[PDB]
């Protein structure tokens, strides 16, 4: 014996508030609780981004043509470069299989424990499982002086350095550097 | 070969999470959310074209392109 359920006013307002707010926006400014960014960023530096990203969105296949001679070489280059990588990539797929088997063996055995420690392992605090902090050991740090010299260009390194100042500006991990 | 290095750092967390697949799952405010995408146009390891909705999202990115 069960009857229909009536509506909550919460579902009502959300249906209506949107239509008030499709025209407006919630992202635009301190309407949202928003702190300013790292002051290394400036009004002019965003225009440096905008003025050139405005250029990238306006690109197409019709603003551009390419010579066939450049194209035919591009096959053998990126085909064989990829061929080395398919060999590399398909290994990880094979590797991760055997890695996951090892996890499956133990999870069968974790049941085969006493009462005390079996509580903790199942009921661990997520703070310990939630460690995504860096270390002195990170392959971007450990191999930095090597990798800085292995590339063909400084620009492709500048792809890394300018990338971090952004992410450092996001999590606010940069300060007065 | 860097791709072959992160297999370890990802492996150990499979035991910590008891999962076969791991993603870092950040969620950003608007300004932070755009700059993280500028990062991703300008990686040396990946050339990208980005697609999204008008609304920020819990992004699900691999550690490989992650860095600070």
């Amino acid at each position: 014996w069960n009857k229909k359920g009536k509506v909550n006013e919460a579902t009502v307002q959300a249906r209506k508030e949107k239509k008030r707010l499709k025209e407006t926006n919630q992202f635009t400014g301190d309407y949202t609780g928003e702190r300013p960014p790292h002051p290394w960023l400036s009004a002019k530096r965003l225009r440096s981004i905008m003025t050139q990203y405005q250029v990238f969105a306006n690109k197409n296949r019709l603003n551009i043509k390419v010579d066939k001679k450049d194209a035919v070489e591009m096959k053998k280059q990126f085909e064989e470069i990829g061929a080395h990588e398919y060999y590399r990539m398909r290994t990880e797929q094979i590797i991760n299989e055997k890695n996951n088997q090892v996890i499956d063996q133990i999870n069968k055995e974790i049941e085969t424990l006493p009462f005390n420690i079996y509580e903790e392992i199942t009921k661990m605090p997520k703070d310990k499982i939630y460690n995504f902090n860096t270390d002195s050991n990170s392959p971007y740090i450990l191999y930095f002086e090597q990798i800085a010299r292995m590339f063909d260009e400084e620009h492709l390194t500048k792809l890394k350095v300018s990338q971090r100042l952004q992410k450092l500006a996001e999590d606010k991990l940069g300060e007065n550097d | 070969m860097l791709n072959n290095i992160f297999i370890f750092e990802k492996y150990l967390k499979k035991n910590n999470f008891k999962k076969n697949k791991i993603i870092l799952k950040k969620k950003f405010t608007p300004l932070r959310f755009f700059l993280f995408l500028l990062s991703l146009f300008l990686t040396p390891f990946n050339c990208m074209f980005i697609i999204s909705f008008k609304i920020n999202n819990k992004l699900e990115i691999n550690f490989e392109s992650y860095l600070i």
Binding site: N25, F27, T28, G29, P36, P37, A43, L46, R47, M50, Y53, A57 | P30, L31, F33, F34, L37, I50, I51, S52, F53, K54, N56
Partner: peptide, 16 residues
Amino acid sequence: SGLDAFIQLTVPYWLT
């Protein structure tokens, strides 16, 4: 639409 619609909305406020 898409990513291009954050950017006329979010950025032009924080320029000032």
